[PDB]
């Protein structure tokens, strides 16, 4: 029913910066008392949401003084006066004036830091896997920034796409980086038909791709 429109959907910010998240309801949020039930939550990775600001502008207790909120009618704003490393996570507005309570889409706050290139590492099939007739080839792309990366697989020069499983960590809370794992699974019979397996990563930090490879001897 009542729609909350939250922007930006991603908030890149440097430590120390002022930032602003905005939330637009499609209806007045004044209740049957004079109050206006718009809240703000921060959900840190893995965790549940926590309450930052309630009723447009009042800082919830045990909430750092650098969060504050304001607005009226149909546009509302959560202001962060000085980003810290704690502050990464997803940020939501919610309205509670109207049943059903509705939440904004969220704004993922990214800590912006200096560029960092992937630490690529590749792994041949373990012996224990190969006896059971499977051949997985794993390749870690560790601690890079920014998050936009793309990994590629090369088998005896030619590219290979069917068989890959990709996974991506969230933004590390200590060094503000990103990692990715990629596994390419074949049978033992196909894997012994090839000689060279390569793992290629193209990222912002280089024009040339980072490449780690092995041969079966």
């Amino acid at each position: 029913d009542v729609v909350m429109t939250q922007t930006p959907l991603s908030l890149p910010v440097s430590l120390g910066d002022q930032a602003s998240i905005s939330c637009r309801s499609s209806q007045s949020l004044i209740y049957s008392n004079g109050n206006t039930y718009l809240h703000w939550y921060l959900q840190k990775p893995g965790q549940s949401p926590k309450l930052l600001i309630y009723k447009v502008s009042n800082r919830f207790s045990g909430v750092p003084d650098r969060f504050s909120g304001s607005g009226s009618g149909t546009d509302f704003t959560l202001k962060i006066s000085r980003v810290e490393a704690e502050d990464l996570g997803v940020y939501f507005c919610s309205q509670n004036t109207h049943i059903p309570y509705t939440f904004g889409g969220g704004t993922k706050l990214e800590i912006k830091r200096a560029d960092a290139a992937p630490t690529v590492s590749i792994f041949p099939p373990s012996s224990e896997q190969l006896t059971s007739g499977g051949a997985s080839v794993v390749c870690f792309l560790n601690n890079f920034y920014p998050k936009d990366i793309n990994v590629k697989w090369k088998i005896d020069g030619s590219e290979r796409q069917n068989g890959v499983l990709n996974s991506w960590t969230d933004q590390d809370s200590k060094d503000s980086t990103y990692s990715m794992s990629s596994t390419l699974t074949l049978t033992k019979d196909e894997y012994e038909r090839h000689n060279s397996y390569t793992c290629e990563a193209t990222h912002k930090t280089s024009t040339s791709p980072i490449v780690k490879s092995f041969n079966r001897n």
């Binding site: 949401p49 590492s121 960590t169 990715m180 794992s181």
Partner: protein, 211 residues
């Protein structure tokens, strides 16, 4: 910091029902509305409804009337949501919360699937045959989640990257990397530890160098 205890995961079958529990404690359960929020991976918070443990009065979100049923037991200080006629759109994390007080529970990850619980295969990942060295653990073909993967019983927290599990045809795969200095391995042993309670699998894999 956690007043509401919720089970961590729960596996259920399409078309079945499940009753999720939310155990209040350390406050007057009868004094505050209890709310239920759903979050599908890829975030997004949907409010399901609330109930007032003192009287039993409920409010439901029209999107969930046909799906959810909220109840209390004021003797045991427990709240219940029952999700019935389950499809895979009901796989999500389900939260109970006291809005007025900002009490939340940890959420329960509800998996809806026909797959039978399956035990992982754990493969050591030694480096290929120069200052730091990276090792891996491959955990493959298990169901459902979660698997719990530590390194040396959690004593190399720094330098560990565990990647979110990735599902494919009712089976999950899991990988973790650990990075130490070169003087540490194979000087000292590094063992990957895997637990998957749903299948009672609890195994260690010592990373041995290849050759």
């Amino acid at each position: 910091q956690v007043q509401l205890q919720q089970p961590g995961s729960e596996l259920v079958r399409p078309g079945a029902s499940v009753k999720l529990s939310c155990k209040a404690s350390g406050y007057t359960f009868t004094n505050y509305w209890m709310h239920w929020v759903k979050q599908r991976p890829g975030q997004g918070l949907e409010w399901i409804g609330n109930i007032y443990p003192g009287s039993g009065t409920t409010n439901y979100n029209e999107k969930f009337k046909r799906k959810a049923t909220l109840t209390v037991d004021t003797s045991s200080n427990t709240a219940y949501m029952e999700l019935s006629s389950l499809t895979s759109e009901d796989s999500a994390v389900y939260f109970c919360t006291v809005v007025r007080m900002d009490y939340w529970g940890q959420g329960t990850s509800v998996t809806v699937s026909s797959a039978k619980t399956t035990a992982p295969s754990v493969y050591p990942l030694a480096p290929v045959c120069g200052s730091s060295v990276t090792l891996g653990c491959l955990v493959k073909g298990y169901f459902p989640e979660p698997v719990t993967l530590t390194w040396n019983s959690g004593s190399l927290s720094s330098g560990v990257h565990t990647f979110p599990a990735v599902l494919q045809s009712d089976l999950y795969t899991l990988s973790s990397s650990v990075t130490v200095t070169s003087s540490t391995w194979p000087s000292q042993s590094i063992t990957c530890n895997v637990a998957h309670p749903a299948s009672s699998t609890k195994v260690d894999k010592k990373i041995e160098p290849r050759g």
